[PDB]
């Protein structure tokens, strides 16, 4: 079906593989597995240069079963089995695109949809940085505790209202969605930097894309996974310190890459 090239890098002094992306779509599956690979909880044969989506799907599902939790009461086991079935049923969507419904009040705040179950069973934190600026009470009131799916419905309803307060609440909430279209705000960056733990491997949602995220020396980094950098041994991590996408490229030991 689809094949992905593998990049071998020096992660914590050990040869470690990461999956690389060409076409748009497979970011959810690759962000989850690149976490498992960087954590050495899923290991590949040392020679493999290229892998298809089927073995990645099987490697993942193989780990979900080996990651079965202990000390679970019968209530937890029943709720676990129902969650495990539904997550496996939608597991194929990982390679085509995963549906997310954020709320703009916290980096860990999503709607608990079945596509969140995959991250729960693997204990992989899922983050976003799409946060409302709390110093602007206009937006805080207009957006409230709405999810994205609710806010677009509120804008449509407000845009045709006769209440002068409601038309302004929708206009402000519309202004917010357009100004923050890359799905990352500076308040999100500040909350992410202080929420993600040092050394934590997690998944990051931003601009309709999933990235593997970690924190080193207090700085957030995103795993470089585009095949344009497949031969660049010195381009492994990209720093996340602005909403402009102007990050610093770093090698596998988080050292700055010299311009060459």
């Amino acid at each position: 079906m689809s094949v992905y090239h593998i990049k071998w890098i020096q992660w914590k002094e050990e040869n470690t593989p990461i999956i690389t992306q060409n076409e748009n779509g497979p970011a959810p599956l690759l962000a989850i597995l690149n976490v498992l690979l960087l954590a050495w909880k899923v290991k590949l044969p040392p020679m493999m240069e290229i892998i298809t989506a089927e073995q990645l799907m099987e490697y993942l599902g193989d780990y979900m079963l080996d990651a079965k939790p202990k000390e679970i009461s019968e209530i937890q086991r029943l709720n676990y089995e129902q969650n495990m079935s539904d997550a496996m049923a939608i597991l194929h969507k990982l390679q085509t695109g995963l549906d997310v419904n954020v709320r703009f009040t916290g980096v860990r705040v999503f709607e608990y949809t079945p596509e969140c179950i995959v991250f729960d069973l693997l204990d992989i934190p899922l983050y976003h940085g799409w946060l409302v600026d709390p110093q602007i009470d206009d937006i805080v009131k207009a957006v409230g505790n709405c999810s994205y799916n609710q806010l677009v419905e509120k804008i449509i309803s407000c845009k045709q209202s006769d209440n002068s307060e409601l038309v302004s609440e929708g206009f402000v909430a519309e202004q917010f969605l357009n100004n923050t279209a890359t799905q990352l705000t500076y308040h999100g960056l500040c909350e992410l930097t202080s929420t993600v733990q040092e050394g934590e491997l997690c998944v990051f949602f931003r601009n309709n894309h999933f990235s593997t995220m970690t924190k080193y020396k207090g700085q957030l980094y995103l795993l470089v996974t585009d095949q344009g950098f497949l031969t660049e041994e010195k381009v492994v991590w990209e720093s996340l310190h602005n909403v402009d996408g102007d990050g610093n490229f770093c090698d596998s030991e988080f050292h700055l890459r010299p311009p060459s």
Partner: protein
């Protein structure tokens, strides 16, 4: 209007609801009786998952209907 919320184990609770109540609201009403945060709740009806922003009437949930609650860990 009263609907039932049944766990996978089989425990059933009654809620006083309105057909216009969102399922976020009924998740908060489950929190009032059972103590689970809404973001740790999963509600299923007619074999499909209900979305937080929809109402009971959007899914055609009528009186004396039973929702299925699934927990997360």
């Amino acid at each position: 209007m009263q609907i039932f919320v049944k766990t996978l184990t089989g425990k059933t609770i009654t809620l006083e609801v309105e057909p216009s109540d969102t399922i976020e609201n009924v998740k908060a009403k489950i929190q009032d009786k059972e103590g689970i945060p809404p973001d740790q709740q999963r509600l299923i009806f007619a074999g499909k998952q209900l979305e937080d922003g929809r109402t009971l009437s959007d899914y055609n949930i009528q009186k004396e209907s039973t929702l299925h609650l699934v927990l997360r860990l």
